[PDB]
Ligand binder design. Structure first.
Ligand SMILES: Nc1ncnc2c1c(-c1ccc(NC(=O)NCc3ccccc3)cc1)cn2C1CCCC1
Ligand SMILES: [Ca+2]
Ligand SMILES: [Cl-]
Length: 430
């Protein structure tokens, strides 16, 4: 008898799913992935619930101040996000001390401004040996009273938001009838992208594929492989229409491409640390692809999408094998050689795009002028607002020898902690 509890309100939208309120308890009947069959103790109704909307009773995830699986960097992002304030905090799983916890607190430093500081929690629990606690709630309650050595007196738990409704169960292949393609967002050589609604309840994006040398079944086995290479920083693939012309249904990214977003009013107001953060998020996506021994092949700001929350995700991963030289590595233009190192070059160019708020690479120059200038050994100069250290990241991406370009694993780690000395990752306290 496994009782779980709702962490958020959920409104039912399908045939057999349950509505519930935050706090409602339920018996688990079946653990079938993203959807679980449950019985609500509040309503007595049996049906399906999103497994990520609930957690086991009295376990830590039920706590408003606990955040499961959040990294140090993502803790910073959450705590710095709109709606928080001085002393805003969270307790979370320790990224580097497996099995243990860490505390992240929002602070203000005169020189830099808003910041997040991190304290290791020592397992009974303590941060300093002079203050020991049986529970984390005890721990939380003490530092709410006064800063006992901490950078800031604890105030309010970090703002959380409802996670995304998972896709309808068993709905990978859907009939075209379930869609209304309401607004053409983009159009090109290989098809179109539309804002769309699925079965009157869910906003999505649909990429329409023009018929081609691609074999129908060959195209689907490829898409079915991409659906397994899921990651937070890769556009989620939701569904497919298997009948020509092929529709690919993905999550809707409310702010469009990074390219268009940066060239916008709201984009041009993004200060430099934001842009680097965007870069780090993309690099994290590319680090996943790198680990999986895959390749993207078409990295640039037009193939990065931005969510309403300013989360950047990589789009069109995989479309390259199923089917703009100013972003391409020499050994890939002059030869056929595309590797992850060619993506690294492309990332460097992307890095420039970001810092130049969308400006086209090599402005004034053109494709043949560029290819010849590459064989010289020309590289784009450092823009006025780009820090020297960010620039030499780009330069390292632009080595002629592909094997001398750094990994995305390393790039991500440098961009993530760009403003933080390694020794200052965690705080010390007597
Ligand atoms: N998801 C979105 N949400 C909101 N706006 C979006 C988009 C997209 C978008 C971009 C790329 C893709 N590509 C894609 O899903 N490829 C999946 C695939 C297909 C076959 C094989 C492997 C992978 C889908 C949607 C594009 N756009 C805008 C339309 C023009 C610029 C951005
Ligand atoms: Ca330290
Ligand atoms: Cl019961």
């Amino acid at each position: 008898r496994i009782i779980v509890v709702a962490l958020y309100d959920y409104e039912a939208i399908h045939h057999e799913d349950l509505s519930f309120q935050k706090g409602d308890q339920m018996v688990v009947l079946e653990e079938s992935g993203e959807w679980w069959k449950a019985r609500s103790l509040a309503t007595r109704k049996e049906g399906y619930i999103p497994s990520n909307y609930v957690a086991r009773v009295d376990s830590l995830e039920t706590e408003e101040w606990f955040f499961k699986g959040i990294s140090r960097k993502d803790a910073e992002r959450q705590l710095l996000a709109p709606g928080n304030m001085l002393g805003s905090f969270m307790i979370r799983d320790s990224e580097t001390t497996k099995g243990s916890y860490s505390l992240s607190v929002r602070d203000y430093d005169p020189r830099q401004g808003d910041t997040v500081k991190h304290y290791k929690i020592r397992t009974g629990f303590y941060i300093s040996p002079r203050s020991t606690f049986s529970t984390l709630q005890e721990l939380v309650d003490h530092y709410k009273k006064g800063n006992d050595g901490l950078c800031q007196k604890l105030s309010v738990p970090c703002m959380s938001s409802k996670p995304q409704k998972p896709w309808e169960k068993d709905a990978w292949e859907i009939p075209r009838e379930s869609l209304k393609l309401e607004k053409k967002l983009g159009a090109g050589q290989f098809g179109e992208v539309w804002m769309a609604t699925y079965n009157k309840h869910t906003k999505v994006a649909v990429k329409t594929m023009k018929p081609g040398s691609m074999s129908v079944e060959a195209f689907l086995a490829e898409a079915n492989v991409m659906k397994t290479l899921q990651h937070d920083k890769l556009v989620k693939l939701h569904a497919v229409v298997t009948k020509e012309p092929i529709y690919i249904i993905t999550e809707f990214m409310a702010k469009g491409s990074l390219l268009d977003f940066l060239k916008s009013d709201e984009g041009s107001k993004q200060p430099l640390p934001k842009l680097i953060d965007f870069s780090a998020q993309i690099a994290e996506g590319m680090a996943f692809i790198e680990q999986r021994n895959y390749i993207h092949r078409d990295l640039r700001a037009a193939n990065i999408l931005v969510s309403a929350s300013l989360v950047c995700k990589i789009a069109d991963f995989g479309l390259a094998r199923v089917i703009p030289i100013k972003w391409t590595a020499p050994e890939a233009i002059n030869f056929g050689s595309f590797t992850i190192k060619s993506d690294v070059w492309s990332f460097g160019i992307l890095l420039m795009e970001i810092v130049t708020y969308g400006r086209i690479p090599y402005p004034g120059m053109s494709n043949p002028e560029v290819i010849r200038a590459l064989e010289r050994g020309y590289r784009m100069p450092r823009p006025e607002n780009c820090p020297e250290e960010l620039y030499n990241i780009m330069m390292r991406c632009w080595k002629n020898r592909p094997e001398e370009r750094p990994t995305f694993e390393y790039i991500q780690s440098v961009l993530d902690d760009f403003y933080t000395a390694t020794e200052s990752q965690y705080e010390e306290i007597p």
